[PDB]
Design a protein around this ligand. Structure first.
Ligand SMILES: CN(CCCNc1cc(=O)oc2ccccc12)C(=O)c1cccs1
Length: 124
């Protein structure tokens, strides 16, 4: 079975909107989303659809850009670093579940480089 996807709202968690979080949605997320290699990362891994019955036996903190997008749209994050951590979790999950040289690992490496390029300088 698939696990529940990560929460995109939580009334127990305090919200915030910052210039950096606005930039992370308008610029970083929405630019990465259009990359030719973004498609594996635009939704939670559907292990039933993709016939990956070991995916969630290995990956215990799943994350994807669709979840990140919803979290940004909901002001779920307190600050930009919290959002950056979710991106880094998404990339590392890919490297953990797969192996060096795999096509999807090449995709995540390219997206991670573009991600780092975009967050190198954030607004103030
Ligand atoms: C080795 N593989 C297949 C590994 C299993 N497939 C996936 C692994 C993963 O961590 O995330 C995914 C996300 C979407 C679709 C397939 C996968 C690949 O290189 C490719 C997976 C999808 C694009 S190329």
């Amino acid at each position: 079975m698939n696990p529940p996807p990560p929460e995109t709202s939580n009334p127990n968690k305090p919200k915030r909107q910052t210039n950096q979080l606005q930039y992370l949605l308008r610029v970083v997320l929405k630019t990465l989303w259009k990359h030719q290699f973004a498609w594996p990362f635009q939704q939670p891994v559907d292990a039933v659809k993709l016939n990956l019955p070991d995916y969630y036996k290995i990956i215990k903190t799943p994350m994807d850009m669709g979840t990140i997008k919803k979290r940004l749209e909901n002001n779920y994050y307190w600050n930009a670093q919290e959002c950056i951590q979710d991106f880094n979790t998404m990339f590392t999950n890919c490297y953990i579940y797969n192996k060096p040289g795999d096509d999807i690992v090449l995709m995540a490496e390219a997206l991670e480089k573009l991600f780092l390029q975009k967050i190198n300088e954030l607004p103030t």
